[PDB]
Design a protein around this ligand. Structure first.
Ligand SMILES: CC[C@H](C)NC(=O)c1ccc(N2CCN(S(=O)(=O)c3ccc(OC(F)(F)F)cc3)[C@@H](C(=O)NCc3ccc(OC(F)(F)F)cc3)C2)nn1
Length: 561
């Protein structure tokens, strides 16, 4: 079947959509080549529709069936519970699309009586009707990028049911999605790791091979490749768990009425078309993609005969490290891997390339690199080209945004030369200028929402990355050059100018005392010649990373209202 069928009605916006990077003095102090930075808008939705629309080829074989049997057997060990409406309400991210039934995410999060009553009615309907397709909205995601040489990117399309349905999805499945991937995949489950744990996993996997070869596999539009039978298989896996009787009914109803497909409506109420693939804005998008990618990849590894595979899966992101059989055989065996993935309906975007240097693999838009700590010891850490983080940071300085990618980037990429020298220096200077150091900000890391005060960054970073994150030095020539090239391209001041600026920022934070002084001492010790002794921060041991800062969860994109 075709992944989508369209009517000719357009994907329409809700509010005006800015295309060009707005300019203000503070955003310009970070990045001056503003004409290179753009936001995707509904204007390019038609271009995206053409790429995501295609027929699917699915031929399952014994290797696929063997893996599915293992997965169903593993799933049978899981006990998952129904979430109360109240817990499902509290997990709703702030600013997700309001309901068309007279309430928004803020009402849901507050457990407002009107929101709760409507959610209960949607729940009763899922228990009573297992077949009527549930309506979905299609929107063009507005995301910021830097223009490229060999290419602008069209907007991603987000497909989501109404807010009341979204809360019901958490009631029926949040506990299932929270437990099932680890039970099924064990150490291959990517979302259980911090950046430090992911790098440790990759390095250990690489070192475990006699002659390692690794590759990332880029599926062409993964959500569109997911078939009705894949979605019905995910439903069968969920049902292997020990579940509550109403959860079993609601899971079947959500699968048949929503997950397998359904009508697409634009913001103006017009019929846009029909979907027969993964909806990007449902609770099961991340879990379902992780499970389905894992099953297909593990089967394709076996179909290709790849030796001693170690896989790491985060949604549609796949990285495989195996035993090399020589360059010509590896090239042939990767083509066989691709051919099997193609038969399972996971065809390639860019064909995979065998890599013999761990640093040359990009996965979860990042690569392994090396630096040294305060004692000169080698430290592996995750980094990435800083172009998109910098372009987004400049937009977020010029415009108030609901979610701050800069904050998520400082958190995830705290040990990096670019996040420390540029992002921390810039944002702490902006927060000082605007008197906003104490205000909590939202960020989203692969759908996990967090509410964080900038003044809590040092204990959060210590707990997440370790004390070495404040002492890394001797970054690689390749890493230094990639950051330097990015700065010249975007019109960002050179690292030595940021170093000069950080000395003033660090001094201002120190003068404020308390948490602010800890920000100056720890985050900016790289900027001074005479170093301060960085001892473990007491607040780092007191906090809980996973639990104190959560502000909800989304399984996939969803429009910010
Ligand atoms: C529900 C079922 C589905 C399948 N699950 C999900 O969809 C899902 C989605 C997100 C998510 N989390 C928790 C673990 N981490 S975490 O980093 O430990 C962390 C913990 C607390 C924290 O709190 C603070 F914000 F307060 F600090 C901040 C961060 C984040 C993460 O995405 N990790 C993987 C990863 C690691 C490195 C990568 O590479 C590079 F580093 F390059 F980005 C890329 C991905 C966010 N967990 N689950």
């Amino acid at each position: 079947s075709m992944s989508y069928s369209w009517t000719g009605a357009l994907v329409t916006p809700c509010a005006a959509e800015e295309q060009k990077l707005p300019i203000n003095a503070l955003s310009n102090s970070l990045l001056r080549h503003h004409n290179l930075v753009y936001s995707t808008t509904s204007r390019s939705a038609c271009q995206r529709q053409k790429k995501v629309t295609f027929d699917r080829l699915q031929v399952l074989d014994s290797h696929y069936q063997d893996v599915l049997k293992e997965v169903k057997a593993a799933a049978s060990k899981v006990k998952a519970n129904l979430l109360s409406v109240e817990e499902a309400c509290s997990l709703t991210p702030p600013h997700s699309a309001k309901s068309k039934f007279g309430y928004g995410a803020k009402d849901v999060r507050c457990h407002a009586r009107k929101a709760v009553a409507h959610i209960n009615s949607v729940w009763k309907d899922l228990l009573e009707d297992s077949v009527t397709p549930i309506d979905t909205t299609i929107m063009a995601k507005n995301e910021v990028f830097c223009v490229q040489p060999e290419k602008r990117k069209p907007a991603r399309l987000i497909v989501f049911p109404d807010l009341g349905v979204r809360v019901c999805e958490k009631m029926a499945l949040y506990d299932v999605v929270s437990k099932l991937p680890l039970a099924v995949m064990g150490s291959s489950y990517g979302f259980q790791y911090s950046p430090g744990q992911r790098v440790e996993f990759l390095v250990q996997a690489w070192k475990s091979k006699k002659t390692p070869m690794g590759f990332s596999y880029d599926t062409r539009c993964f959500d569109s490749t997911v078939t009705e039978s894949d979605i019905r298989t995910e439903e069968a896996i969920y049902q292997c768990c020990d579940l509550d009787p109403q959860a079993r009914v609601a899971i079947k109803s959500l699968t048949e009425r929503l997950y397998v497909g359904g009508p697409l409506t634009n913001s103006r109420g017009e019929n846009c078309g029909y979907r027969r693939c993964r909806a990007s804005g449902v609770l099961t998008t991340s879990c379902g993609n992780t499970l389905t990618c894992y099953i297909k990849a593990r089967a394709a590894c076996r179909a290709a005969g790849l030796q001693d595979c170690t896989m790491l899966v985060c949604g549609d992101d796949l990285v495989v490290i195996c035993e090399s059989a020589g360059v010509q055989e590896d090239a042939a065996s990767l083509r066989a891997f691709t051919e099997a993935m193609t038969r399972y309906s996971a065809p390639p975007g860019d064909p995979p390339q065998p890599e013999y240097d761990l640093e040359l693999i990009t996965s979860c838009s990042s690569n392994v690199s090396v630096a040294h700590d305060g004692a000169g010891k080698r430290v592996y850490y995750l980094t990435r080209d800083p172009t998109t983080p910098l372009a987004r940071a400049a937009w977020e300085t010029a415009r108030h945004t609901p979610v701050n990618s800069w904050l998520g980037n400082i958190i995830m990429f705290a040990p990096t030369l670019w996040a420390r020298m540029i992002l921390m220096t810039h944002f702490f200077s902006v927060l000082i200028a605007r008197d906003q150091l104490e205000q909590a900000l939202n960020c989203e890391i692969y759908g996990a929402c967090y509410s964080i005060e900038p003044l809590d960054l040092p204990p959060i970073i210590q707990r997440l990355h370790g004390l070495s994150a404040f002492s890394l030095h001797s970054y690689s020539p390749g890493e230094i050059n990639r950051v330097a090239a990015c700065l010249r391209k975007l019109g960002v001041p050179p690292l030595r100018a940021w170093r000069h600026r950080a000395r003033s920022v660090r001094a201002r934070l120190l003068s404020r005392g308390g948490r602010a002084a800890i920000c100056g001492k720890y985050l900016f010790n790289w900027a001074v010649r005479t170093k301060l002794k960085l001892t473990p921060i007491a607040a780092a041991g007191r906090l809980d990373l996973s639990g104190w800062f959560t502000a909800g969860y989304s399984g996939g994109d969803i429009y910010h209202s």
